[PDB]
């Protein structure tokens, strides 16, 4: 709707230079008001989009933290079980 507004002005002026009435000017005025309102709304929408981006970044950060925790877990599992108990049993059988 914002583009037809910009085209109507050019068409009406192009018709005024060649000649072409008073009504089309009022049409231009209402067109003006509509265009202004649309622009403002658009700007607000842009700001809201920015907020959305921020939230996305936060989510990504939390995901990274979770990944690191998982990795530390896998290390702790690779550090430690029944084979040592069996070697302790055979060691007790060797000490006595």
């Amino acid at each position: 709707q914002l583009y037809e507004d910009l085209c109507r002005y050019e068409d009406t002026l192009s018709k005024l230079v060649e000649s072409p009435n008073l009504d089309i000017a009022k049409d231009l005025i209402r067109t003006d008001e509509a265009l202004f309102e649309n622009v403002k709304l658009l700007a607000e929408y842009d700001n809201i989009y920015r907020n959305l981006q921020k939230i996305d970044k936060d989510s990504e950060e939390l995901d990274s933290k979770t990944r690191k925790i998982l990795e530390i877990l896998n290390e702790c599992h690779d550090e430690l079980x029944x084979x040592x108990x069996x070697x302790x049993x055979x060691x007790x059988x060797x000490x006595x």
């Binding site: 914002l2 583009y3 910009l6 002005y9 050019e10 002026l13 192009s14 005024l16 230079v17 000017a25 231009l28 005025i29 003006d32 265009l35 202004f36 622009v39 403002k40 658009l42 700007a43 929408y45 842009d46 809201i48 989009y49 907020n51 959305l52 939230i55 996305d56 936060d58 989510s59 939390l62 979770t66």
Partner: protein
Amino acid sequence: SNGEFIPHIFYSLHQIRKDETLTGSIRHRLKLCKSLISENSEWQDIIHQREQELQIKRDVLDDLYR
């Protein structure tokens, strides 16, 4: 988009409506407005989704503490 370039056109348009170079300049600015707007309820829905992720994770940690 930018809303400062529109009253500048409306001033001259008012003058022309009250009465080639004047309308030529008006169109010269209107083209820049066309390229500007062309380059540049919905978001609400989106807002909720993003927060949905945050809420689930908070609930997990709360599962650890409680």
